[PDB]
Design a protein around this ligand. Sequence first.
Ligand code: 21I
Length: 282
Amino acid sequence: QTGYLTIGGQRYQAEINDLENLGEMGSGTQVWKMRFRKTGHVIAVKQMRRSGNKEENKRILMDLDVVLKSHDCPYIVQCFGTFITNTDVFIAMELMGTCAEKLKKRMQGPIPERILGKMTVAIVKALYYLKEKHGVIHRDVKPSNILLDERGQIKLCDFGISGRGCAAYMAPERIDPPDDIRADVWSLGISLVELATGQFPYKNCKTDFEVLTKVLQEEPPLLPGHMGFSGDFQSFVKDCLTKDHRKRPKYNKLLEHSFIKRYETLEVDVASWFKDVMAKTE
Ligand SMILES: *CCC(=O)Nc1cc(C(=O)NCc2cn(C3CCC3)nn2)cc(-c2n[nH]c3ccccc23)c1
């Protein structure tokens, strides 16, 4: 079903001209920021040109296939609807604030652990939902694929390489495979260290292959102990950053980790902290 926008619990018969274009948005690719004239809702609309790249359009249709069937997951970016015109296809995604990568740039420093705790519970349950409900492997987990908004929500972005990735967050066994959902556990751990310290773990790398050598030759980059990080946080990163993929835990035991169980029940106001950081901007 296309041509219908479903914001909240109301379905509106919409058209491409019923959306007011408010300009394009900067993200990993063509997503527009639009305003539904009949309701006033600001939504994200990515436009897939019919005469576009067949390889890029294939990646757009792959993630939409996963996004559409991920409606019962609260940690995946939702699709409000689709518009199939004669020359274009418009996918209406929900509008969020920014990604963890750009949030790292505006912060110009580390991200608090209490914010990464809610983020950790969100991304793990999002990846676990993909492996169980649809057998989907993200294979490209990185801060650029972790969205946030004013309401304090944290969600997963888009899986254009998902199967039933960036070389900077690639798992050790993805570089030298013997003879795999645990590959994203490493990518998540590398993303956590980058956000918890404000610096990429494998620095001073001018080549993608040089990053691959440091993953295999050097020890996994754990969290520093002089920043006040909790023991449960350091235990979660150390478990996620296990070089031997056979010893790295799956999402089942990751959910049973004490660091996850803390921020499932803890009340962390991600909404107020998000508005304060975005206020200080260039
Ligand atoms: C990693 C880069 C990234 O995530 N970029 C990104 C930016 C924005 C964005 O800047 N949106 C503008 C905006 C406007 N508001 C107020 C105006 C009243 C609402 N808040 N943010 C948005 C998104 C984004 N949001 N949902 C998305 C779904 C799929 C892809 C991107 C996306 C991303």
